[PDB]
């Protein structure tokens, strides 16, 4: 553990709770891409199969279970409990264009040709593009509520802090994983437009339009 990974992980949990309580309290999933939430749920399901093979720490086990629980819980609120407010007409991103290529790439570009390693690699490739349906839906519809931009900020900030974590771990422990780093850089660069607009508009009381 270093303070970058921990703050990244706290940023990630914050993101997930904010989105969960926004939907819970307002009893609506207005402006939320169900499809992005399916992808995050699929990312945690393929990444955390090592719950069955490895005990790292109680923290590590706990967060994996919290992340899995909240991801499935968010998909439940969107597609069952509050489906009445699910804007299916504007959440039109074709997710097959992420899943099939990422699946294909996870099979051909990996550290090891075993089922657990391939599914991990899949989790890492998929997380890098998981937010595109959410960002596309905002580009399409008018704007995002303030609370949604805060979710996107903290989610975006989480993997940005992992990059710093990876700099720290390379310098200090000689640890490097180029599949996680490259995917991490893709994941983070996809938040650049949103980050700019969040700083210059949302933190200045303006709202955050992404034309296209």
Author numbering: 1 to 212
Can you provide the manuscript's text about this entry?
In the archetypal KDEL-retrieval system, a seven-transmembrane receptor captures escaped ER luminal proteins carrying a C-terminal KDEL or variant tetrapeptide sequence in the mildly acidic pH of the Golgi. Signal binding to a luminal cavity in the receptor triggers a conformational change in its cytoplasmic face, exposing a lysine motif recognised by the COP I coat complex. Hence, the KDEL receptor cycles between the ER and Golgi capturing escaped ER proteins in a dynamic retrieval process. Our previous work has shown the KDEL receptor has a transporter-like architecture and undergoes pH-dependent closure around cognate retrieval signals.
We then determined structures for chicken KDELR2 bound to HDEL and RDEL signals. These structures with TAEHDEL and TAERDEL peptides have resolutions of 2.24 and 2.31 Å, respectively. In both instances the overall structure of the receptor is similar to our previous complex with the TAEKDEL peptide, with a root mean square deviation (R.M.S.D.) of 0.223 and 0.153 Å over 200 Cα atoms for the HDEL and RDEL structures, respectively. Both HDEL and RDEL peptides are bound in a vertical orientation with respect to the membrane, with the side chains clearly resolved in the electron density map. Superimposing the three peptides reveals little movement of the peptide at the −1 and −2 positions when bound to the receptor. For RDEL, we observe slight movement of the backbone Cα atom of the peptide to accommodate the larger arginine side chain, resulting in a minor repositioning of the glutamate at the −3 position in the receptor. Nonetheless, the position of the positive charge at the −4 position on all three peptides is identical relative to E117 and W120 within the receptor, supporting the view that a salt bridge is formed with E117 on TM5. For RDEL, the arginine side chain sits in the same position as the amine group of KDEL and could thus interact with W120 via a cation-π interaction and E117 via a classical salt bridge interaction. We therefore conclude that both E117 and W120 play a role in retrieval signal binding, and the only major difference between HDEL, RDEL, and KDEL is the precise nature of the interaction with W120 indicating that this may be a critical residue to explain the differences in affinity.
